Design brief:
The PDB classes it as hydrolase. The entry lists the keywords MsMutT1, Nudix hydrolase, histidine phosphatase domain, Nucleotide pool sanitation enzyme, enzyme action. It forms a monomeric assembly. There is one protein chain. Helix content is 32%, strand content 34%. It is α/β, with parallel strands linked by helices. The protein has 2 domains: 130 residues, no CATH class; 162 residues, no CATH class. The strands form 2 sheets. Strands 1, 2, 3, 4, 5, 6 and 7 form a 7-stranded mixed sheet that branches. Bound molecules: 8-OXO-2'-deoxyguanosine-5'-triphosphate (8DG) and magnesium ion (MG).
Length: 292
């Protein structure tokens, strides 16, 4: 009864001079935003990136989440999550669903879009900056129980499910154009982004200030380190622990007056922090890749 989809406001810098992509589908003779249904096991961001490529022929990097829409379809209810997405390459070619694509300034695109829920999404897009950089704060994957581990608990490794979460995070974090890697000084934090390190061929920088013990004793040192990592070129992944993340996220959202639409703290979850000129403009919580 409820069909789950994901899509994007794909934009390009025409010089940044923002134009957004609007696609035409012969089946309905309509103009809309690229989007499609989630495949089995696929997360919303991974589906959004795939649909951009399938419907527009562009590669893109997702940025800020633009909320969700719900509308009735003959089958019941369509529910779609949307992202801002910056084109990074490729080109349009016609496909089974799409015969035309136009690139328009936002005011012209608003007039071209015929569905109310697409115009609501485009309004969300123009409300805040879209040429953003992204900090990806990841809680390490499942690693069994402290109680049932003999050895230094710092060496406690991911369990099978956690190793699978770590593999599933590669497509999720590459959808946001991850480029640099940071982990708290715990094996289970490093192992979570080990698969991404191999995909990027990139080293993980160890972070002694971002462990639970270090955070609990010196919040301020951890906040300063987060802002320093965030200031460096690239889109950093920071993998840390359950008693660290809520504190850091809540502190930054209060300071920037940013209200997260979703929240949680599960093992394997990701916070997508969107920055524009050093200011937080979005804080998007993504469930673990193996959970709804
Ligand atoms: N794309 C889109 N279609 C909408 C919106 N509002 C609305 O009533 N519709 C209509 C168009 C169709 O009559 C119907 C189903 O269209 P759809 O695009 O959601 O579904 P679909 O299965 O054809 O396509 P897709 O999810 O595979 O991309 O819903 C909207 O905001 N966007
Ligand atoms: Mg589609």
């Amino acid at each position: 009864h409820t069909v789950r989809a994901a899509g994007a406001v794909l934009w390009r810098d025409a010089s940044a001079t923002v134009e957004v992509a609007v696609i035409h589908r012969p089946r309905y003779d309509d103009w809309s935003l690229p989007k499609g249904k989630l495949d089995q096991g696929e997360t919303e961001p991974v589906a959004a990136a795939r649909e951009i490529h399938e419907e527009t022929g562009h590669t893109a990097v997702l940025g800020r989440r633009l909320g969700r829409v719900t509308y009735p379809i003959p089958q019941g209810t369509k529910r779609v999550w949307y992202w801002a997405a910056k084109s990074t390459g490729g080109d349009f070619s016609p496909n089974d669903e799409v015969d035309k694509l136009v690139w328009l300034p936002v005011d012209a695109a608003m007039d071209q879009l015929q569905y109310p829920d697409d115009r609501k999404v485009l309004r969300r897009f123009v409300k805040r900056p879209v040429d953003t950089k992204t900090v990806l704060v990841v809680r390490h994957g499942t690693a069994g129980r402290r109680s049932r581990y003999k050895g230094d608990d710092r060496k406690r490794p991911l369990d099978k499910r956690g190793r699978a979460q770590a593999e599933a995070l590669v497509a999720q974090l590459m959808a946001f154009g991850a480029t640099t890697l940071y982990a708290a000084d715990r094996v289970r934090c490093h192992q979570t982004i080990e698969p991404l390190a191999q995909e990027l061929d990139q080293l993980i920088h160890n972070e002694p200030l971002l462990t639970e013990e270090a955070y609990a004793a010196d919040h301020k040192a951890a906040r300063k380190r987060l802002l320093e990592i965030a200031g460096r070129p690239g889109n950093p992944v920071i993998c840390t622990q359950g008693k660290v993340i809520p504190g850091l996220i809540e502190w930054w959202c209060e300071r920037a007056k940013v209200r997260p639409e979703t929240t949680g703290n599960r093992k394997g979850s990701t916070w997508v922090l969107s920055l524009s000129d050093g200011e937080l403009v979005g804080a998007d919580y993504l469930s673990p890749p193996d959970e709804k």
